[PDB]
Amino acid sequence: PVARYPPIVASLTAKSKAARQRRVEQWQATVHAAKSVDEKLRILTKMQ
Amino acid sequence: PETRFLSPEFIPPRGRTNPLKFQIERKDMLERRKILHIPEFYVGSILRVTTADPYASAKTSQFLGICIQRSGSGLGATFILRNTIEGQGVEICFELYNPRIQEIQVVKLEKRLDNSLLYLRDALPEYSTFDVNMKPITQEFNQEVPVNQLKVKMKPKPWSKRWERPKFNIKGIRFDLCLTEEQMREAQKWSQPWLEFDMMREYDTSKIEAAIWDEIEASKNS
Amino acid sequence: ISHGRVFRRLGLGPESRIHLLQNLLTGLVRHERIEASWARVDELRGYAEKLIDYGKLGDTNERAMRMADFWLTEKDLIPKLFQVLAPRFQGQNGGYTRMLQIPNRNEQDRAKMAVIEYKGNCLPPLPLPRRDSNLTLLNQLLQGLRQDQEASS
Amino acid sequence: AAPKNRRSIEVNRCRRRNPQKLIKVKNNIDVCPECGHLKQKHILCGYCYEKVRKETAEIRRQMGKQEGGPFRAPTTETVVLYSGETPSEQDQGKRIIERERKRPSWFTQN
Amino acid sequence: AIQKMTRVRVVDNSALGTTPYHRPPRCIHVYNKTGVGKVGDRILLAIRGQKKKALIVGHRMPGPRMTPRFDSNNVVLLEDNGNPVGTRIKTPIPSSLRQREGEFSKVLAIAQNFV
Amino acid sequence: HGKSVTWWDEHLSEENVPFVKQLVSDENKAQLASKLCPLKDEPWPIHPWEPGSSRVGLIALKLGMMPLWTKDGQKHVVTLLQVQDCHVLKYTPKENHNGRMAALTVGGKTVSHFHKSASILEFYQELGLPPKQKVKIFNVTENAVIKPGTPLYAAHFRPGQYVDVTAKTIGKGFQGVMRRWGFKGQPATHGQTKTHRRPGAISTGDVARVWPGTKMPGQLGNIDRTAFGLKVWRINTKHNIIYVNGSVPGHKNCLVKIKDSKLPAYKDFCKNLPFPTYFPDGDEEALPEDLYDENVCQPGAPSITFT
RNA sequence: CCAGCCCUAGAACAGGGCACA
RNA sequence: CAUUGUUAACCCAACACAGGAGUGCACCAAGGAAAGAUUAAAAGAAGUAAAAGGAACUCGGCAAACACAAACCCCGCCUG
């Protein structure tokens, strides 16, 4: 009775810059959902 | 409201056979049904078939059992009946339009959760034992063939086939008690999700069913 | 033996073929006219016909909704598919696409290439091979034969 | 396996000059009545297809420049018009592409 | 289809069919010219480490139409002279065996169930 | 002058193509309607049946397979052969064909004029019939000759008879030896390297060659095969269908040459059958819709039970 | 007669279809 | 306020080689593409599935397998 459409976000496993930005947003949301500041800093600084 | 029920045998195959053969076979099977009353039944319903056997005491031989599977196209439709007799399970593949059939009586019109419940060979004997002298159950048309949601147990591995593979797509088996999470994850490696969205391997026979229904109505009015 | 088969092998297997056809169909829905290999386009013709048949089936049909969700990779095409292509194809039954073999590709592969196009698009018309005019010699003789047949009845 | 003797030039010619290996002459060649170039009887004209491809590339470039986003697709019908043209009542309500170039001869109004 | 090295189950009440053994009763040789035996073909068995004859009652392979297909290769013991050494048969028996009564007379005379 | 290739659709117009299709279609229809009554125009003198005589055959279309139950409870498998269009094209005399038996030329179903050559189209124009797909020759005796241009009906055979069937089997292409001749292969994994399906040795040592009759991989399937002694059960007159027992060589929707069984056990069975052919105009009586054999369990049956 | 499009015909080459719909 | 090393897709294998490569970082926020285009003959390699039988093949249950167990001998204490 109502049009149910999927979101217009870019794909996740693609090579495009929009897909890269979506993966960046995904790991940023992971950092947001992290509970303790210790784990937040760990995930933010695990890259060297 | 009344829903039209077209028997599975009237559906012609996907091949490129000339439709005149299918028309002739449909005429012959309708003429056969004019004498032999083939009632309505689905996969899982319990039937009793009377066959003409020359080497028995009486010329008639009764056999009651649950319908395993129905397959075929036209005058060659077959259905398999399963019944446990004194601990020894027995499966007989009857033909719908065989002249040696005397009478078919559906004692319980009932569907199940799977279109092809061949797994009764691996199921427990409690689900294959059926009283031969059971009384026929009459139901109202407004029941709309109630689908029996019965989760079936399973004998330990190995089984007759690999019922855990996605190619079967079976829900009537209680897997959470017989299989483990590792086996469930491993069985998903043979899954082909694209075959459901392929949009081309489907068989659309709407107008075919319409024409067959019109022909059957004409034969009845004849 | 390859008797009685309708699908041709493409890509790295069945799933790779499905993904290639999915990408080609997405490009076709997005651009309304694309060009690819002749076999790929001939295979994509039927899938495009079926996709148009599903799009014409309505918006609330969740079967067609999830079908378009699987096929159209770019989700900005599903509203387009349901509100541009499907509405403009209502009286037409199966004449939705047009496929034409173009000259071979200038690259060294020299592959057989075709172009597929949805009818009624906002693009310049392809140089379709048209029939000869009725003023030709044979066409005029056939018109005379037709006039004689009509006068005989 | 190894060859036992050197094949003579006579047999070499008899092998690699047989009509099975010679390139056959294609007799389906015709001229395009529109531009006068060459084409086959079952294949579109290369020159006309190149013209159509250039025009389509220009039209798509302009319609993509109109949409500053990659996933911003038109939700309604689209119509392309050239210099010296105005959208009629049947062309109103749709997305409009405007080209500075005049409308070519092959492109029909419709 | 019962062939060589098939583990069959003796049905008729006999000592060889009732007494347990550290090796299941396997097949020996199908007396038909084809190495595959069907319902109603004389067979040889090695039961409890000795030779004996038997008759195939039912197999697990799908056969002709309207023919019962059991879930276990049931066989009944038979002597060399053509007489079953057992007393009675409990499991069902395909009614197609009663076609050739001349060779299965005493074997079917002890049969209680006919399917 | 490098003349190009030209087909019948290249120079026509959108308004002429359907006109041409209709002009050939109604022409073929009128021709088949004019050739529908051959016994009244000019039939050849019908000769009486002889013990050492033979009869002409038919060219039908293999539709498919069906089951057929007999009154004794048994079940046989029949194949449906549809006699769409059987016409006697030409007649070659005995002395001009074989010196022992005359030859009759029979044509199959109707095909298009737009794909046949000039000579075949000229022959069919002089005959007055549309072109046929498969053209076969039947060796008959000098007393069972029929005038060319006469149509034939599936009622040519009666319920209960033995026939022979000739056709091209399903051509499986260039297949291996295991599928062609049935040679056994080597074991799978006991060490065999690149030999799982090889034919092995093909000859001996001292012969220093291979014999001409050596079985080897090659073409498989596309060859004219003939099955003998197939019994016919049911004859449908309305749709011109013949029910032939057993397997019929040839894929479905293909042409199949049916003839009388030349087996020695059924050499003198053509006595009760119509000797020249089935003439529906001679008896002035319409046969039943389905001619069943004396043992076929008809669709309308009382569900026979043993006694 | 074989441009092109199919085939239960086929490695290529060959063979059968493209009018009833 | 001295001098020197700060590039790179790299080194060793005759090669832009499915090979040999020390240490610190997480398994992707970084790298790439198994397919030049067709048809889908035989044989060959790999994978998946297969009714009834479950080693009857074979020197050997070699490989494979919904199992991945228990025992008896010969030689060597065992790890190496």
Ligand SMILES: [Mg+2]
């Ligand atoms: Mg012993």
Ligand SMILES: [Mg+2]
């Ligand atoms: Mg073939």
Ligand SMILES: [Mg+2]
């Ligand atoms: Mg083998």
Ligand SMILES: [Mg+2]
């Ligand atoms: Mg080795």
Ligand SMILES: [Mg+2]
């Ligand atoms: Mg080796």
Ligand SMILES: [Mg+2]
């Ligand atoms: Mg190997």
Ligand SMILES: [Mg+2]
């Ligand atoms: Mg010699």
Ligand SMILES: [Mg+2]
């Ligand atoms: Mg040809």
Ligand SMILES: [Mg+2]
């Ligand atoms: Mg550096």
Ligand SMILES: [Mg+2]
């Ligand atoms: Mg590559």
Ligand SMILES: [Mg+2]
């Ligand atoms: Mg490649």
Ligand SMILES: [Mg+2]
């Ligand atoms: Mg490829």
Ligand SMILES: [Mg+2]
């Ligand atoms: Mg192969």
Ligand SMILES: [Mg+2]
């Ligand atoms: Mg293999």
Ligand SMILES: [Mg+2]
């Ligand atoms: Mg396996």
Ligand SMILES: [Mg+2]
């Ligand atoms: Mg197996």
